[PDB]
DNA sequence: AGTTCACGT
DNA sequence: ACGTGAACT
């Protein structure tokens, strides 16, 4: 339903990462930027229950090595 | 490991 | 409307 949900699922499929896998990779970035992230929050992202806010869109962009705009976009193409 | 929801913001 | 942990499967 949401763009973020489709962008996360795309990364999960391409890099064979589970939710817990992406969650663990964000941990060093969480302590660094002071932006916490629980597993229930990530779960709602993937399932279009809720969209990430300003701080967590940045957090996930750094973790997955993608741009904030791509993570918020409809586009399928990396850059 | 992943999901739902009352609650605080 | 957003994140979170309790409680859940």
* Residue ranges of domains in chain A: 1-79
Residue lying closest to nucleotide B2, CA to C1': A43
DSSP A65: T
Protein-contacted positions of strand C (CB under 7 Å):
2-7
In the three-class reduction of DSSP (H, G, I as helix; E, B as strand; rest coil), residue A34 is classed as coil
**In whole angstroms, what is the distance from residue A8 CA to residue A14 CA?**
10
Determine how many CB atoms are found less than 10 A away from the CB of residue A17. Answer: 16
Determine how many CB atoms are found less than 10 A away from the CB of residue A37. Answer: 20
Instruction: Spell out the CATH class of A1-79.
Output: mainly alpha
In angstroms, this model's resolution equals 2.6
Task: Give protein residues whose Cβ lies within 7 A of nucleic acid chain C.
Answer: A 36-38, 40-41, 44, 50-53, 56
Closest nucleotide to A51 by C1' from CA: C2
């Amino acid at each position: 339903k949401t763009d973020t949900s489709n962008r996360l699922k795309q990364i999960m499929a391409e890099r064979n990462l589970k939710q817990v896998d992406i969650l663990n990779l964000s941990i060093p970035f969480q302590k660094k930027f002071g932006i916490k992230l629980s597993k229930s929050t990530l779960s709602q992202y993937v399932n279009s229950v809720q969209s990430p806010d300003q701080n967590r869109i940045y957090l996930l962009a750094k973790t997955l090595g993608v741009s904030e705009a791509w993570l918020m976009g409809r586009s399928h193409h990396h850059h």
